[PDB]
Amino acid sequence: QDLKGVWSELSKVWEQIDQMKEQPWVSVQPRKLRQNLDALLNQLKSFPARLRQYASYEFVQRLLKGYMKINMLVIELKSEALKDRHWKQLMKRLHVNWVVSELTLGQIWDVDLQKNEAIVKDVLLVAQGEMALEEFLKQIREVWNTYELDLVNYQNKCRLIRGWDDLFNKVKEHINSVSAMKLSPYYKVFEEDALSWEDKLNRIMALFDVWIDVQRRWVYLEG
């Protein structure tokens, strides 16, 4: 007669697990997932001691223990640093659970995130490096695509260029950063794009080292 009580208590728990796992990983909010998992945890804690000897309650309890253990791995797998390339590497090293990026939570959850911890640690480390590199390239494109040559008047005769020092500091800073970029381990996937920017960066220096010269002496010659 206690089997009806324990199964009636556990049926809503298993249904709650079912509506948790059916949430799409595209639409997962993981802080709210932690809140719902803690709600399931204190619902588990609310149960009396008559059911503490049955195998089903403790089986669901260690399932929820595994879930709140892998909650941090979920909250890091939902980071914006991971892209489709690292999902392909997760396919390559995780073998099973062919996901077409329909991205159910249950198919991500059923694979052994606790046993395969070093695998996703390596994947997230690689994704961290790629995101760092990509945001550096975004900073390069944003800074140099909007840079403007400041122009100051000259004796109501001409309009010269002011501010060689900050511009040359920016060119030297970016060119040395691309030189250190080519030494980075995450270099290949973006490589040719950086090369193109490197070419453009060098061309900018190849103009302005001339420019001060054809500025300065000309001004002196006018004098």
């Binding site: 802080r31 932690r34 909650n71 941090m72 909250i75 980071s79 914006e80 640093a81 991971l82 480390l125 961290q128 490096g129 995101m131 760092a132 590199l133 945001e135 550096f136 030297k172 800073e173 040395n176 950063s177 250190a180 970029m181 030494l183 980075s184 381990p185 995450y186």
Partner: protein, 794 residues
Amino acid sequence: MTRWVRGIFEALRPLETLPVEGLIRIWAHEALRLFQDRLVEDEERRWTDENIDTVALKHFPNIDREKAMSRPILYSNWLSKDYIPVDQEELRDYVKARLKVFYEEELDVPLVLFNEVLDHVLRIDRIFRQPQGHLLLIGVSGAGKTTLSRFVAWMNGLSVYQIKVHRKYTGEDFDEDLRTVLRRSGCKNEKIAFIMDESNVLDSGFLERMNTLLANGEVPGLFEGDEYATLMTQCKEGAQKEGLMLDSHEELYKWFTSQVIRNLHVVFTMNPSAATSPALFNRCVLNWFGDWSTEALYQVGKEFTSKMDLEKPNYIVPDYMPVVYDKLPQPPSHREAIVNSCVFVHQTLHQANARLAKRGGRTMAITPRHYLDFINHYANLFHEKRSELEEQQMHLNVGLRKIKETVDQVEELRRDAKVNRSTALLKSLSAERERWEKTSETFKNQMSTIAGDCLLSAAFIAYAGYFDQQMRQNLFTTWSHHLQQANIQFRTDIARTEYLSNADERLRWQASSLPADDLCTENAIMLKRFNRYPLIIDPSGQATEFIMNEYKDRKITRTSFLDDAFRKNLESALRFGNPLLVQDVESYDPVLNPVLNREVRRTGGRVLITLGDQDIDLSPSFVIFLSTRDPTVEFPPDLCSRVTFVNFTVTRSSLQSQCLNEVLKAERPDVDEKRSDLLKLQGEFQLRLRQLEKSLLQALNEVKGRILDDDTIITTLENLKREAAEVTRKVEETDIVMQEVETVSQQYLPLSTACSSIYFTMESLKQIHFLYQYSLQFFLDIYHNVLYENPNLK
């Protein structure tokens, strides 16, 4: 006094009625939070506790004391909607739940909630409650600041704003930052815990521009121009949003000032004893952290080492233990004894640094971060050594199983003029089995010790790196004597280099530019298992070439603090993950302060760290090294909490041991090789023997009626038979060799003392004349010519 008035007024604002006991309880709580919080000496705190009760008894006669005066006096606002007095246990449970959910949200660093950090969290929250509540946190480096502030700021919902200061920072940019902060906190009613640090702010010049915010919460003249129009529009919008209809300029400015008074909190973090202004001391509430007690270190070591297997049920308690945690559960178990010795190590090193400072030597500051690094190194080392022992035990069990299978094959092969010699072959194998089973028993004894042994390595990794050789050995003997005092079983003779490094790594290091000294090899194993980024004290310059030899495959780049383009090199190394060696750390830029502290910030997917004005991404393959050519330096206690120190310098004991080893190699090579084999009685001989056993198992199971083709594989089983017997020999003959190398090194010792005295006279001779400069290479050339190319020695 007006802060006291405002605190009692804010305590009696939401309450309906009180007795006299609650009012005097609130008054005494505010007295304790306003007077005892700034004290350093415990005797002053006891005086304040006595005189508060004396004042409360004197000016309030015929008042019940025990209802009003219960000495664990605490107040909180989280447990209920009122600011009622609470107990300690429920508050500890709530703050432990909040700290456990604080683990998984933004930063994964485990924290320990002992008795004092709870009180400090209560104090920070109480400062956060009051309007015009500004806090100044003073105390030793680490130990709670810039981590408790972030914790209580997250808990009370205040977002955190910090200023990213570098070389380019004028007063106009500071005005813009203050404009943004005041507009966010005033118009939007956003609570901001503006925290300032010792690194980014020591003297920025305009630290008195925020004295008006600390006084009354408004800068006149900050919002001139169109900014007054923008602030007026957003101010009327916000006052409409919270339902306060005001019209003119001045009433809206007064409402803006009141909202800045209510919302914006400022918390400074300062290191104790140029001096700050006394006005800045008067404007804030001053919380003194102090150093962690014996109970706090016991609670840190208990909660961090609870995961590791530390239970010896055989363990007999000694009669008397040197105790430093008086509230230990008497008599202790094995884990309690280990944690008591763990805090005893920290206490003895504090005493040792005080004794070294008594003599006038250069001592460096000791922080709780050193205790954290010691405990983390203990956990990692215990896990690594237990994993290695379990793996080799399983491989031995595999070997025993295949040995029994091969014995079964041989007794099958006795079905069948080779029947004698094959029966000779079995006469080796089972005997070998017996030898193997004996090794199993030794590994059980290896368990007995592998625990305290890891202790005596772990502190040696994290604590005694700055010291010289003699002080390191004295600290080691003190730790070993206390561990024998506490019945902790460990190896009586430990090679510190061989325990933490294999022979192949030592061959790599000697194949790199590294001298073969005991101090240099111990400082080489310093640089393999560090947590914090290391600093090297090398007067010879060999350590820099050793570091660039060890990390040339990761393309290490060389830089120094004295370059103008240093910060871009550090920024590029931080961004792209290439390792960095940084020279001339005596001119220490404080911009490294988060990076050595590993202050990462999870902002979405980004891993942001503050460098200059920029917020840049920490690549996971970054590692940095700091270097001094100059040995005469006194670093700030801030830098003692962030790096681990190694000492490549030469002293009397180091050169004495170098000369003793050199003369024993050159003159008595039998004693030198018998001493070197005593160093090889640890893991080198056993790793070679186990590799030979594994290679024998690679051709042991190939037995299917095939092994009797020539019956000469026994020699491959007999090549194991001799050498292991040699291992059985040198273990049995291990005390006579110790006494022999002690007597022979005792015969040759005054020559080494004379060599050390001659060398220190040679280096002291520089003060006579500017031309009197002689190097260590000069003295080693002297010693080589005397020892080797001597014409009188023939």
